[PDB]
Write a protein that binds this ligand. Structure first.
Ligand code: 03M
Ligand code: 03M
Lengths: 84, 85
């Protein structure tokens, strides 16, 4: 069930080492983790919350923060980057 | 920088999530622990700092069921038992 990240996103994934154009969600989210892990964008105290104003990622979601817990919306933000 | 020398145990593991050197810093090994814990999803969905290694090569090499990434000193203890240095 593969996909394609609008120019920006794709340069995001590829910052953390994708090399394709086509990804299942489950496969893409993996790469997001990379971006958030290598970039300590999670909060250290609230360890499920992510913190993005300042970051490229911030833009892509138009939030400056969010929590991975809630899927209902974590997808939204990602569609909004897929040529989907 | 200050490299450190890991046991035969550990090392296997790192090697599973990429790593190469038979020589690594602190900030280097927590890097791969980091990756392992991530890929083999071992933290808790609700409790994100808490990490269940019950069952897994990691826990059998930290000798524990679980543990908090909060306790700072405390992760250090465990880390050591896996260093021939
Ligand atoms: C939300 C979210 C996403 Cl999406 C992706 C990654 C994380 C995440 C990652 C880490 N938290 C942390 O403390 N470390 C350091 C670390 C490494 C090895 C250890 F063994 C260890 F105890 C501690 C991490 O790598 C915390 N929240 C996240
Ligand atoms: C302590 C610790 C260590 Cl050591 C290693 C990994 C983690 C970690 C990993 C994740 N937390 C999370 O919620 N996801 C799913 C996820 C991924 C990308 C997204 F963009 C996203 F919105 C949701 C994760 O992959 C959370 N704490 C950790």
């Amino acid at each position: 069930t593969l996909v394609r990240p609008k120019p920006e996103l794709l340069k995001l994934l590829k910052s953390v080492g994708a090399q394709k154009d086509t990804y299942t969600m489950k496969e893409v989210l993996f790469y997001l983790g990379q971006y958030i892990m290598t970039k300590r964008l999670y909060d250290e105290k609230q360890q499920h919350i992510v913190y993005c104003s300042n970051d490229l990622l911030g833009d892509l979601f138009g939030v400056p923060s969010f929590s991975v817990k809630e899927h209902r919306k974590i997808y939204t933000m990602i569609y909004r980057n897929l040529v989907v």
